Symmetry: D3
Subunit: 118 residues, 6 copies
């Protein structure tokens, strides 16, 4: 048994609709968002891996393309695009494709983030 992870960065705009009126997050802004997908499972004795890192990247690509260079709030389910909401939303998009998914981390900035484990 082991864990594997792969990291991705996407460039997007968002705003938080439910913060108080003068809160900076309530203004239209953006971030270089980092996403880490983590899987946990058994290592195949012939391949020597769980799945190819490239399969994890390929599995994310359709979701990446929806998020990257986009305004998140216009995506159904991301009307309140906090890191927490986004981590769970990503889990829900990728879990069908990556059944070994064990954690999704979203970082809005280099110093803050959240980790969702479904």
């Amino acid at each position: 048994s082991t864990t594997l992870f792969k990291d991705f960065t996407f460039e997007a705009a968002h705003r938080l609709p439910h913060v108080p009126e003068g809160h900076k997050a309530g203004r239209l802004h953006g971030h270089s968002f980092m996403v880490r997908l983590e899987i946990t499972g058994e290592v195949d004795p012939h391949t020597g891996w769980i799945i190819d890192f490239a399969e994890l990247k390929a599995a994310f690509k359709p979701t990446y393309e929806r998020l990257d260079h986009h305004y998140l709030n216009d995506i159904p389910g991301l009307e309140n695009p906090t890191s927490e909401v986004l981590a769970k939303w990503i889990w829900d998009q990728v879990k069908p494709v990556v059944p070994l998914l064990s954690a999704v981390m979203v970082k809005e900035t280099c110093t803050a983030g959240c980790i969702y484990r479904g």
Copy 2:
């Protein structure tokens, strides 16, 4: 386990020395580091806010402790007479857990390549 965790990272610039190491050990000399602290909290996400707590509330809760550490000599702070990573991590937990009840871990990195994670529950 199933969970949702939030974390926020802070950096502070401080001097320390380790008082119990062998004579001549480099840690025994007055020196310092760019310390990194990561506070992690575990909780439920409110359906209206969409968050556990605002990152800014975490930063504000930590501020008093942060200001005691930054641009200071750690050995002068009570509880930090032996200011190892491990001692500092637990000390920070003890200071913060009262104002951040959902605190689940404290990480302290003395350098970019070496550190400690403390879970106090």
Copy 3:
């Protein structure tokens, strides 16, 4: 002389209005922008510095707070908010209050950037 620099990070939305339909930069998006301010000058013999890093931060603060947590295209002069335009714009905003400014770098992502020198 000696050169000093300091890095600032701001979180902002932008959109490039003059790219072809379909170009990714033409959609409303954002980045965590990095700005490096570089200054060059004489080190005072008594202070041991050119200017305090904090004095540089304070000088930039007004301009920083126009950029951070904002949509760049709404700022006059940033209607086409490329890295190149933004670096020159920051130079033009900051040079009056930091006469020793020698270069401005803007990075939209960690792996690329622009450097402008206005003299």
Copy 4:
């Protein structure tokens, strides 16, 4: 309650993956700047205020580190299929006997891709 210590090491090596399909890039001879994080979990001594000195963990790993660094991994027995997963297991198997409090080994082949192994 628990305390975990960790230290990161970087080594410069070549490898190739022998069991990937014909034209897979990882099947060609190449290399990486590999990063290894060793994590320890255990009691912190009330006198020393640490689990063990970072320097002692470095020393414990040094023999294995020197086998890896500036080498071709496939040549090392046990690393004939030197995936991140296999390497992390292998490092654990070398280091656990010297550092019984070892609780995880992370290997990153690149800055964006990695695996964490936590024992058998």
Copy 5:
């Protein structure tokens, strides 16, 4: 002088070995690195596009050379029989300058802490 410069960074994973170091020198054993290459260009900013050239255009121009380097053994590429950072930075300049006429410098880093800049 008054000027605008752009740069973009690319990382490739490759093996190399230095053939002219003394027997025993670590760099003379087959090994590898996650190499970083930065291309710097300088030119006028077009008043319509607001840019010198699109970052994507610089990436595209470099791709053929990038593909020769990534997931390969450098010593087997003609011109890179002695694949030092110095030699590699110049070799990259020679490959890229014809397709990126605004190219002003090439940086190679073999590790995160050591590298070389060539200006032609």
Copy 6:
């Protein structure tokens, strides 16, 4: 036109700035993980393919590095006012005799700021 080599080193040290005003935070005893970049410029030898081995640059700096690392800077002669600016010049002065091709010294007290000295 030129080939430049560089190598980065990190050392862990205490310092305080003695000529800032009372209550300025840098006036309190503190420390940093300092980063130093040494740069050299010169001809690439066709036989070795290098200017000097990165390992030679590290060895040449080691004595100076060992004075700095895990020490209190203010007690080192020359570093009574251990600003980044003063430190970069001091390192230059210490290193230039054993690294004649030295062309720049950068010092960073934190990851977001620094100083470059070029002689």
